[PDB]
Design a protein around this ligand. Structure first.
Ligand SMILES: Nc1ncnc2c1ncn2[C@@H]1O[C@H](COP(=O)(O)OP(=O)(O)O)[C@@H](O)[C@H]1O
Ligand SMILES: [Mg+2]
Ligand SMILES: [Mg+2]
Ligand SMILES: [Mg+2]
Length: 1288
């Protein structure tokens, strides 16, 4: 298929079937439910190639081959009515960016652009034109796609448009009205006093402003960018206040500067870390080595609330992506290392699973539902973290939507505009913390993606776009820069976010005390139609701005080319504090302004407001029983199991993850905080926790803020930190500013933490952000409706960790034990604004609060003493759902029972069980009870401490008060109820057979959990005699663009005695490396090309289609003694390279998981008998391994191929269930692979490929669960030692 398309030609190539049978059945069921008689539907991918020159036969065959990927679903002959769904004209999918990159890296420069659609063939002969429109509506996303009736209509996607010129606004010819008109036309949202300021500035300059100048100004002066509310003066109840909100936050730093290296002068804060071996490849040698130095710790938390209400996948994705850029742009360049995630939404109202507190109150047409946010949003956030490669290790998820009698009387309070929160930690070198100086003449660079018309102005302008692989490429350049140490050529770096370059470039010169002169036509653009305003102001993603000295440009160019990171020099820093943007195409100057004019401020805001305070109503208990309350509370999403948010996201990339959300042998997501190691050679590390309690703010603003700080501390407390001054906070404030009562409430809550609680505890808040229009208004029938959030403070706590090995979790032991409650509520047992109240549609009277500051500190210090002395068996703090939920979660994690007496906790059993006061349950050895009680007493806590009882083997969850049974249930029954939410979410989002299998396994109490059988001594270093010689063979640690798991791969080989060499595919292509110098090769994990065109396919085909590099690989694999390993993405790659690999004829392909979802699991495997030299000595072992993949499902051609592979004896690993049997049941087998197959070898055993990641778990400390008696080495270390010994 191939036709004229302007000065280019467009080719049409049919792809493979696009939807599996469950997805097809879902569509048919949706049509049936809407009364559309659709007899059948079939979907095929179709590819469009815009060509600038022709393809010869050989090139055409290459292109056709590149576009063969994906699971081998059965093709159907087209039949019925064609509906073709594509991206909207004027947009370029991320798919297109990455597929085009692959074509170019395969030598197809004739390809100008590849794009993809889905051709739907619908047989429904009896449908009206009206009903056809409804069909079309079901098949596409109106915010990013369109529907066409012919394949040839895809030509519209590639139309070339001539550059649009700059437009002036005619102030001199029309007066002020020109500015008023432009304000409305351009959507500038300017205030009257801003229009005054612009009017005078341009009158003084004696010329008309250009549209681009006004837009730039308007962006820079928004609430989003200027923080007017947080810098305002206040008057409250008639009294002027002494400090802004910002100054009150800064009070915490004035009080507690300890350990802080950077606060309030970058887009992340920095604190002291630990001296450890930072592991990376040297610039000159390419060898990975440990560099003993301080790894300091950066932190940042952001939000993306409004875009996520409009288009949740990209909203969440670019929420993560922007925050990752803030981290990498800290100082003079730094390295992200782990993420966190938060969602607050309205009620889910899951079809067929509606809960008794949920009422449908309507919503605006133009936003999505709470359910669609929680379906697509987490996938988007995860897509970014997975493809960029940072593990996502802690988070929160709250539902809230109720009609309540709050501060402004009876009104709807909720999250129709959601909280979408993304944050994280990173490491940074001491000499890079401070931004450098920008010398006059510095070159000013944009690093990253070509711009498009995104973010300007159905709300299309709020529809974002993410390409995480592009950002990984950029991160690698940043890494190379900071890895040069004193020769780091980055003088200054900053992320590109709101306002695009129009904010970022002025900010970067201005932060250096410089001006800039810029050339518009040097900026990389994928949309030649764009105006200067669009080019300068678009919010295209994956971009950074930086300054480099002119003499370092050749170095910078080398770094970028090797990573394949696009970059452009677009201007020069000037001594004069002026901003100039020239346009070589139109020979004119779109921007010509002094910086003081541009960056000049209208006056400060004054907010004159009054306090409103809600009168609580006592909880009406008419319909409440304890048993009913347990069942309801376990069904509140806020409380309920969070698996659907957890296993979708990588938790092992870097090899530094010590404590992830999933805990114990039954992998129950209840960990109270995240912990990473500082390096691959240390037990020092970092921790992250979150505290939040928004519904409390409907009753008491300051208490909600104090509880958020408190809960962050209780979540983190059983991790070995020491001095509380080591804990640093981000404070993210979400409010509906201007809503009656909220402004005074905001001030009071900031004051409560910044002026009071944080200084009194010794907690700094060195970073934070604010989002101040958290409400939603619409017309619902004949009436105005509004849904307003509670004031919503989210606190994230971050700390350097003294020993990651000493972290406690909620996993109860059944050795002889005591359960003790630390009730920091001091028996107040408040029920206001609890999960209990919410699930009966009420708010209640009085909420929890921090009852006693000294006791909170004493709790923290006492926990630190108990952790360091190793006196705790377990800890779980009390939060949503109260003591009942803390104890239940502990019993789920320990897969056991409890026998608990609550007679000491008051006569009100409901209140004792369901209050959400601060504190929690510690478990200690029985023999240590008296000593632990005495320790707690030393910290002033005796009256808060209560012996509850003990954990016991079995399935009974029993709560007594004297001789009365208060509540008694099967622990399994509770655990399954608690699972029903994630069950239902998985069920609607993923393959329902997998969701059901996962859920139903939880009901089998006989599940023994992950468990280990070892065929060898895991402590025996069989490589030691080799290492002792000092002779270290090289390993080629192979990476392609988008690979992310190479550093820990190198480290694993290093520990086994190799010299690990960084080999990029660019090194092979440029002659800098030749495989003939190596005896061992490893293809590493990640998302090369974002897996576009099938995971590992672009990587492999780039090798196959370059005859030189293809020959190199083939030569390597045909040598008699060479060894090769392919892990995950490398396994996929090597499976696509079979034709070069002897003995690989029976290998399968690796395709989309049967669940249709990314699976980040800690899975049980057995090592099976095969020739594999890398698994020698390990046959019959059974131990868990990190799994992190979406396309790991072994796929054979037919059963003859599966039988042949099996009979040849080439299977080397298989998934087993916890009973130890080979399985295809999910998630024990996470991807649906037949016969549990997840590793294969060649006939000679010299090449092994596997989907799981042994290199992520070679350290015991990095295994989510492991036997207590293991040393530093896990079983998986033996793979790398076997490689060493085999080389001799
Ligand atoms: N949005 C999310 N993304 C990833 N993990 C999450 C998310 N929400 C919760 N989690 C994880 O699920 C577990 C249970 O969460 P939750 O019950 O909210 O924690 P807590 O009550 O201790 O504050 C924790 O390990 C938490 O980090
Ligand atoms: Mg919880
Ligand atoms: Mg907790
Ligand atoms: Mg919480």
């Amino acid at each position: 298929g191939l036709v004229p398309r302007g000065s280019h030609m467009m080719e049409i190539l049919r792809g493979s079937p696009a939807l599996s049978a469950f997805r097809i059945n879902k569509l048919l069921a949706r049509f049936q439910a809407a009364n559309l008689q659709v007899h059948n539907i079939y979907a095929e991918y179709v590819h469009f190639a815009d060509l600038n020159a022709p393809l010869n036969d050989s090139e055409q065959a290459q292109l056709t081959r590149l576009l063969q990927y994906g699971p081998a679903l059965s093709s159907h002959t087209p039949a019925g009515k064609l509906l073709l769904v594509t991206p909207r004209p004027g947009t370029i999918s991320p798919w297109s960016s990455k597929a085009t990159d692959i074509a170019h890296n395969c030598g197809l420069q004739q390809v100008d652009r590849l794009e993809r659609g889905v051709a739907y063939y619908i047989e429904a002969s009896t449908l009206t034109a009206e009903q056809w429109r409804q069909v079309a509506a079901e098949l596409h996303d109106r915010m990013m796609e369109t529907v066409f009736s012919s394949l040839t209509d895809a030509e519209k996607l590639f139309i070339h448009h001539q550059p649009a010129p700059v437009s002036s606004v005619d102030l001199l010819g029309e007066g002020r009205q020109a500015l008023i008109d432009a304000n409305l036309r351009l959507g500038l949202a300017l205030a009257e006093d801003e229009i005054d300021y612009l009017q005078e500035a341009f009158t003084k300059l004696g010329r008309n402003p250009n549209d681009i100048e006004l837009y730039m100004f308007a962006q820079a002066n928004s609430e989003h960018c200027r923080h007017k509310i947080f810098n305002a003066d206040w008057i409250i109840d008639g009294k002027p206040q002494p400090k802004s909100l910002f100054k009150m936050i800064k009070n915490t730093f004035e009080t507690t500067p300890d350990y802080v290296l950077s606060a309030y002068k970058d887009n992340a804060a920095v604190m002291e870390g630990s001296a450890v071996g930072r592991y990376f490849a040297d610039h000159n040698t390419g060898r990975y080595d440990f560099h003993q130095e301080p790894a300091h710790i950066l932190m940042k938390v952001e939000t993306h609330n409004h875009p996520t209400a409009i288009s949740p996948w990209p909203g969440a994705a670019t929420g993560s992506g922007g925050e990752i850029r803030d981290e990498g742009a800290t100082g003079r360049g730094a390295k992200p290392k782990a993420g966190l995630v938060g969602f607050s939404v309205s009620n889910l109202r899951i079809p067929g699973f509606e809960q008794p507190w949920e009422e449908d109150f309507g919503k605006p047409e133009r936003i999505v539902t709470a359910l669609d946010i929680m379906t697509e949003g987490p996938l988007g956030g995860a897509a970014f973290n997975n493809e960029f490669g940072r593990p996502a290790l802690t988070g929160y998820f709250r539902t809230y939507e109720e009609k309540v009698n709050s501060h402004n009387g009876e009104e709807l309070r909720g999250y129709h505009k959601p909280i979408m929160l993304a944050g994280g930690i990173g490491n940074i070198r001491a000499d890079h913390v401070q931004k450098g100086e920008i010398v006059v003449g510095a070159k000013l660079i944009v690093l990253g993606g070509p711009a498009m018309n995104i973010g300007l102005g159905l709300d299309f302008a709020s529809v974002q776009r993410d390409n995480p692989e592009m950002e990984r490429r950029c991160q690698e350049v940043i890494d190379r820069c900071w890895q040069l140490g004193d020769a780091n050529p980055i003088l200054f770096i900053h992320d590109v976010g709101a306002g695009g370059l129009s904010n970022a470039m002025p900010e970067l010169v201005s932060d250096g005390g410089r001006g800039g002169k810029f050339e518009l036509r040097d900026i990389l653009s994928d949309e030649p139609g764009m105006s200067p305003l669009e080019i300068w102001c678009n919010e295209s993603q994956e971009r950074y701005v930086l300054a480099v000295a002119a003499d370092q440009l050749p170095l910078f160019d080398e770094l970028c080319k090797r990573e394949r990171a696009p970059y452009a020099v677009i201007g020069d820093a000037t001594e004069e504090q002026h901003l100039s943007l020239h346009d070589n195409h139109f020979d004119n100057q779109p921007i010509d302004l002094p910086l003081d004019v541009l960056l000049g401020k209208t006056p400060k805001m004054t907010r004159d407001v009054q306090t409103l305070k809600a009168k609580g109503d006592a909880l009406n208990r008419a319909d409440i029983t304890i048993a009913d309350a347990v069942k309801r509370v376990l069904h509140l999403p806020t409380v309920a199991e969070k698996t659907f948010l957890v296993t979708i996201g990588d938790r092992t990339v870097t090899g530094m993850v010590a404590r992830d959300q999933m805990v114990g042998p039954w992998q129950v997501p209840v960990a109270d905080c995240a912990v990473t190691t500082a390096s691959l050679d240390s037990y020092y590390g970092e921790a992250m926790s979150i505290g939040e309690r928004a519904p409390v703010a409907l009753l008491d603003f300051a208490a909600s803020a104090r509880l958020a700080v408190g809960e962050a501390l209780t979540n983190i407390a059983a991790t070995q930190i020491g001095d509380i001054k080591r804990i640093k906070l981000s404070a993210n404030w979400m409010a509906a500013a201007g809503h009656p009562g909220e402004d005074a409430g905001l001030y009071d809550a900031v004051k409560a933490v910044g002026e009071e609680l944080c200084p009194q505890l010794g907690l700094t808040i060195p970073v934070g952000k604010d989002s101040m229009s958290m409400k939603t208004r619409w017309q619902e029938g004949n009436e105005q409706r509004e849904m307003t959030s509670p004031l919503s403070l989210v606190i994230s706590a971050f700390a350097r960790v003294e020993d990651v090995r000493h972290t406690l979790t909620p996993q109860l032991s059944t050795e002889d034990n005591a359960l003790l409650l630390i009730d920091l509520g001091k028996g107040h047992n408040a029920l206001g604004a609890t999960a209990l109240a919410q699930v009966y549609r009420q708010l209640g009277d009085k909420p929890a609060d921090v009852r006693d500051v000294a006791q909170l500190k004493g709790f923290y210090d006492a926990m630190q003493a108990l952790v360091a002395a190793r006196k705790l068996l377990a800890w779980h703090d009390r939060s949503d759902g109260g003591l009942l939920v803390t104890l239940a979660e502990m019993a789920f994690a320990g897969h056991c029972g409890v026998q608990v007496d609550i007679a000491a906790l008051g006569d009100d059993h409901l209140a004792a069980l369901f209050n959400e006061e601060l504190g929690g349950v510690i478990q200690v050895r029985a023999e240590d009870r008296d000593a632990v009680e005495a320790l707690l007493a030393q910290y002033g806590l005796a009256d808060c401490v209560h012996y509850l009882g003990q954990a016991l083997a079995g399935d009974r969850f029993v709560i007594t008060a004297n001789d009365q049974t208060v509540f008694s249930e099967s622990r399994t029954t509770l655990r399954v109820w608690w699972a029903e939410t994630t069950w239902q979410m998985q069920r609607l989002r993923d393959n329902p057979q997998c969701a059901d299998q996962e859920h139903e396994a939880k009901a089998n109490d006989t599940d023994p959990g992950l468990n280990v059988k070892l065929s060898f001594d895991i402590n025996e270093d069989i490589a030691a005699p080799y290492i002792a010689t000092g002779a270290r063979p090289k390993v080629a640690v192979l990476r392609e663009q988008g690979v992310n798991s190479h550093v820990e791969m190198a480290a694993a080989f290093h520990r086994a005695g190799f010299d690990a060499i960084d080999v990029h595919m660019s090194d092979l292509l440029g002659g800098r490396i030749g495989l003939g110098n190596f005896h061992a090769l490893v293809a590493c994990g990640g998302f090369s090309y974002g897996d576009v065109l099938g995971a590992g396919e672009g990587w492999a085909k780039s090798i196959l289609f370059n005859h030189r590099v293809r020959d190199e690989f083939e030569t390597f694999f045909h040598r008699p003694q060479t060894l090769a390993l392919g892990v995950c993405n490398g396994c996929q790659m090597m499976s696509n390279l079979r034709e070069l690999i002897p003995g690989s004829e029976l290998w399968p392909r690796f395709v989309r998981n049967h669940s249709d979802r990314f699976e980040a699991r800690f899975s049980l495997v057995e090592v099976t008998q095969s020739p594999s030299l890398l698994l020698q000595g390990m046959v019959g072992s059974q131990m868990p391994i990190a799994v992190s993949h979406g396309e790991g499902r072994v796929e054979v051609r037919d059963d003859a191929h599966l039988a042949a592979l099996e009979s040849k004896g080439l299977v080397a690993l298989r998934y087993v269930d916890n009973f130890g049997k080979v399985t295809e049941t999910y998630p024990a087998n996470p991807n649906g692979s037949p016969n549990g197959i997840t590793a294969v070898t060649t006939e000679n055993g010299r090449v092994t490929i596997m989907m799981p990641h042994p290199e992520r778990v070679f350290r015991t400390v990095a295994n989510s669960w492991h036997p207590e008696n293991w040393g530093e080495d896990s079983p998986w270390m033996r793979i790398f030692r076997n490689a060493r010994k085999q080389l001799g």
